[PDB]
Amino acid sequence: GTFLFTSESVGEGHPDKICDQISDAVLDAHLQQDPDAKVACETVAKTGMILLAGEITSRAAVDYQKVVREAVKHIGYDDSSKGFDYKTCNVLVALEQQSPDIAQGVHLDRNEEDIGAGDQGLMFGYATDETEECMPLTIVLAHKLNAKLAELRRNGTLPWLRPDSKTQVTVQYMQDRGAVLPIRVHTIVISVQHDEEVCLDEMRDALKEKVIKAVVPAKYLDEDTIYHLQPSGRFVIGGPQGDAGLTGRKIIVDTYGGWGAHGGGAFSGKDYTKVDRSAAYAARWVAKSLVKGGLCRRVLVQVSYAIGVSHPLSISIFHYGTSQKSERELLEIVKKNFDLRPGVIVRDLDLKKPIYQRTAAYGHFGRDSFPWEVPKKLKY
């Protein structure tokens, strides 16, 4: 009845995550002036470079140099000794207007509620009762380990820490009538960029005592738990210098850590008309509503769209054997309670609000009571 499952997370200074945060800082900057901005901003990061590439049609006047550098400053890359500096890096911009062919097929001369999906695609929502926030324990722990590293870096407890980090948590679970019950942490990995002065043993001791023990409850750790702390042995070169980053390269870290399912679409740098983000947020909202409403213990929701068409093409619900209701019954409850057209999701989830940079590290789900995390009271 037991099995292992592993999920990973990355820190704010992981190069892919830098890109997601910059893409969302650009989106937020546009939404602060023009709530109806059409934004599709990709970011690429490599040694000394932030490149913005994509399409934006907006009435906002945005200073890309300032927005980008302020996001990098927040992350903590502020000196050439760290491998990257917001003050002196290159910021290159290759942004054009949104394609008029896309604009005419999606939103031009359309009533807001009846705007078409900004692209075709499939999206999933997932929820599990194994935690109060309805998220898998593996991914919650992996995110919290990265957040702890950033906290200790920012408060000066471990001044040798740099912003680039990755974590990985393997949990041993028990199966329970379709639901899953965490038993213990089997393995933890932590890799984090560091300065030239700190030694390996000092880092491994700090990662176990000040990071793992400050995050993971002792009841999950035992004599058999395996620790891989700084397993490469040296991580002085990091951030974009160590590895090129791109927007939308951490989509499993952004969602459920491998649990549930994923349709492939990235979230960051996109306004609400891009259903890769809005419909995944709405699907999470449906999934969490079905679990918090007591209809299932674990649930997966798939939706799909065609570019230019408002209603989803398909809707599917899998309850893993944790509901007394059939999929047909759950679909009827979802039809009575939710409208998954993008032009209605924007109203229900307040998706013109500039809160997107806040979503771009530590996962988009299970945190901070964003609108998609507040369950809808179901009527049936």
Ligand X SMILES: C[S@@+](CC[C@H](N)C(=O)[O-])C[C@H]1O[C@@H](n2cnc3c(N)ncnc32)[C@H](O)[C@@H]1O
Ligand Y SMILES: O=c1ccc2n[nH]c(C3CC3)c2n1-c1ccc(OC(F)F)cc1
Q: Which residue has the tokens 């065609």?
A: 306
Residue list 170-209, contact with a second copy (CB under 8 A): 170, 186-187, 189, 191
Tell me: does residue 332 bind a second copy (CB under 8 A). Answer: no
Q: 129 among the known binding-site residues?
A: no
Sort residue 111 into left (φ over 0), alpha (ψ -120 to 50) or beta.
Answer: beta
Query: Is 202 annotated as catalytic?
Result: no
Nearest to 40 by CA among 304, 274, 263: 274
- HSE at residue 376, side-chain half, CA atoms within 13 A, is 21
Rounded-to-integer distance, Cα 312 and Cα 340, Å: 7
Contacts of 73 (CB under 8 A, 6+ apart): 86
Range in contact with ligand X (rule: CB under 6 A) among 1-9, 148-156, 237-245, 330-338: 237-245
Q: Which of ligand Y, ligand X, a second copy, none sits in contact with 300, Cβ below 5 to 8 A by type? A: ligand Y
Residue 320 or 371: the one with the smaller Cβ distance to a second copy is 320
Q: How far is the CB of 327 from ligand Y (least distance, A)?
A: 5
CB atoms closer than 10 angstroms to residue 35: 17
Tell me: does residue 258 bind ligand Y (CB under 6 A). Answer: yes
Rounded-to-integer distance, Cα 44 and Cα 288, Å: 33
Contact (CB, 8 A) for 373 and 288: yes
Residue list 316-345, contact with ligand Y (CB under 6 A): 316-318, 327
Contacts of 286 (CB under 8 A, 6+ apart): 125, 301, 334, 338, 340
Residues in the chain: 380
Query: Is 244 annotated as catalytic?
Result: yes
Rounded-to-integer distance, Cα 359 and Cα 278, Å: 13
SS3 6: strand
Tell me: does residue 8 bind ligand X (CB under 6 A). Answer: no
Residue list 32-71, contact with ligand X (CB under 6 A): 40, 55
Residue 278 or 292: the one with the smaller Cβ distance to a second copy is 278
Residue 25 or 333: the one with the smaller Cβ distance to ligand X is 25
The active-site residue out of 42, 119, 271, 373 is 42
Tell me: does residue 313 bind a second copy (CB under 8 A). Answer: yes
Query: Is 101 annotated as catalytic?
Result: no
CA quadruple 269, 272, 273, 274: dihedral sign: positive
Among positions 243, 329, 339, 348, the unique one binding a second copy when judged by CB under 8 A: 243
Q: 250 among the known binding-site residues?
A: yes
Residue 311 or 376: the one with the smaller Cβ distance to a second copy is 311
SS3 111: coil
Contacts of 352 (CB under 8 A, 6+ apart): 31, 35, 36, 272, 346
Q: How far is the CB of 331 from a second copy (least distance, A)?
A: 9
Range in contact with ligand Y (rule: CB under 6 A) among 189-197, 226-234, 272-280, 311-319: 311-319
Q: Which of a second copy, ligand Y, ligand X, none sits in contact with 15, Cβ below 5 to 8 A by type? A: ligand X
Among positions 20, 24, 28, 42, the unique one binding a second copy when judged by CB under 8 A: 42
Nearest to 362 by CA among 16, 17, 88: 17
Query: Is 347 annotated as catalytic?
Result: no
Contacts of 298 (CB under 8 A, 6+ apart): 127, 128, 129, 178, 179, 180, 291, 319, 320, 322
**Strands 90-96, 49-57: pairing kind:** parallel
Query: Is 133 annotated as catalytic?
Result: no
The active-site residue out of 82, 194, 274, 284 is 274
Binding residues for L-methionine: 55, 98, 243, 274
**Residue ranges in contact with ligand X by CB under 6 A:** 14-15, 40, 55, 98-99, 101-102, 105, 118-119, 164, 166, 191, 232, 234-235, 238, 242-243, 307
**Residue ranges in contact with ligand Y by CB under 6 A:** 3, 5, 175, 258-259, 261, 300, 302, 316-318, 327
Active site residue ranges: 14, 16-17, 42, 55, 166, 235, 243-244, 249-250, 270, 274, 276
Binding residues for Mg(2+): 16
